Design a protein around this ligand. Structure first.
Ligand SMILES: c1cc(CNc2ccc3c(c2)OCCO3)ccn1
Length: 279
């Protein structure tokens, strides 16, 4: 399948070169997979989700996304126009308030929630969790992300936006999950992207168009935007049968575009997520 005039990040993940604008992908499109978006919520009524999104848990007075951040990330995973895996099922877990903030204890509870809740959902092709959040190093936060991964969920986490070594942030620094840095449309490391040995992969993170609350759209930047590209890619590849939740991060690194990004610090992987789809 070909989506013309796609957001640059979608075109990038199906291309061996920057500077194109069509997204190419197998029509299975993540059907039969599920992606949890652990964030500020999801505006499931947005036409772009086509009834495939729902809120499953909140720790606050509403499950609605009063911020936009979670809706944007969910849109990059699986919206019809802005998403990588256009037929996946999206499940929202609201661990962040409408200002985008949340306590680590709540974030930990949300991760353990997903590890159990997947047993209440139909995801025959596999389960992914996208975590576009983080803070300073916490062994307990890292352990929760490790548990979620161990339970059979492909965990993708944002590296962080401090232009710093991600070893000092959580869940970014957890070795067993997939830690995602951000790149721009010219294949440069995004100016804010964290780096370091703990990163596993880069995805598009600068000027990313996706869904927003109020049935709208907007373009924003962050490792929060790169993470759902990788989460959606994992769901798409699991639906194709090419990998599993336990192996998807390594498979994405194995099949990535290699050595094509600029301003990657010595010691950080130079790997850009790529779907290797041959039309
Ligand atoms: C790991 C990941 C994160 C999430 N990073 C992030 C999220 C949203 C953002 C952002 C940066 O930068 C600008 C505003 O939007 C924060 C801390 N550690």
């Amino acid at each position: 399948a070909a989506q013309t005039n796609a957001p640059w990040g979608l075109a990038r993940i199906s291309s061996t070169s920057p500077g194109t604008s069509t997204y190419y992908y197998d029509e299975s499109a993540g059907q039969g997979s599920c992606v949890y978006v652990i964030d500020t919520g999801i505006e499931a009524s947005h036409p772009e989700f086509e009834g495939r999104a729902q809120m499953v848990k909140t720790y606050y007075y509403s499950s609605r996304d009063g911020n936009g951040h979670g809706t944007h990330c969910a849109g990059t995973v699986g919206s019809r126009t802005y998403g990588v895996a256009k037929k996946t099922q999206l499940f929202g877990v609201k661990v962040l308030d409408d200002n985008g903030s949340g306590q680590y204890s709540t974030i930990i509870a949300g991760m353990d929630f997903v590890a159990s809740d997947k047993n209440n959902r139909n995801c025959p092709k596999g389960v992914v969790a996208s975590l576009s959040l983080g803070g300073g190093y916490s062994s307990s936060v890292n352990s929760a992300a490790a548990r979620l991964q161990s339970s059979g969920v492909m965990v993708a986490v944002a590296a962080g936006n401090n232009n710093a070594d991600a070893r000092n942030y959580s869940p970014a620094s957890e070795p067993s999950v997939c830690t995602v840095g951000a790149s721009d449309r010219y294949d440069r490391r995004s100016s804010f992207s964290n780096y370091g040995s703990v990163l596993d992969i880069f995805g598009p993170g600068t000027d990313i168009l996706s869904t927003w609350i109020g049935g709208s759209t907007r373009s924003i930047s962050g490792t929060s935007m790169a993470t759902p590209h990788v989460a959606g890619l994992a769901a798409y590849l699991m639906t194709l049968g090419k990998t599993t939740a336990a192996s998807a991060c390594r498979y994405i690194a194995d099949t990535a575009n290699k050595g094509d990004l600029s301003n990657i610090p010595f010691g950080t992987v130079n790997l850009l997520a790529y779907n290797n789809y041959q039309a």
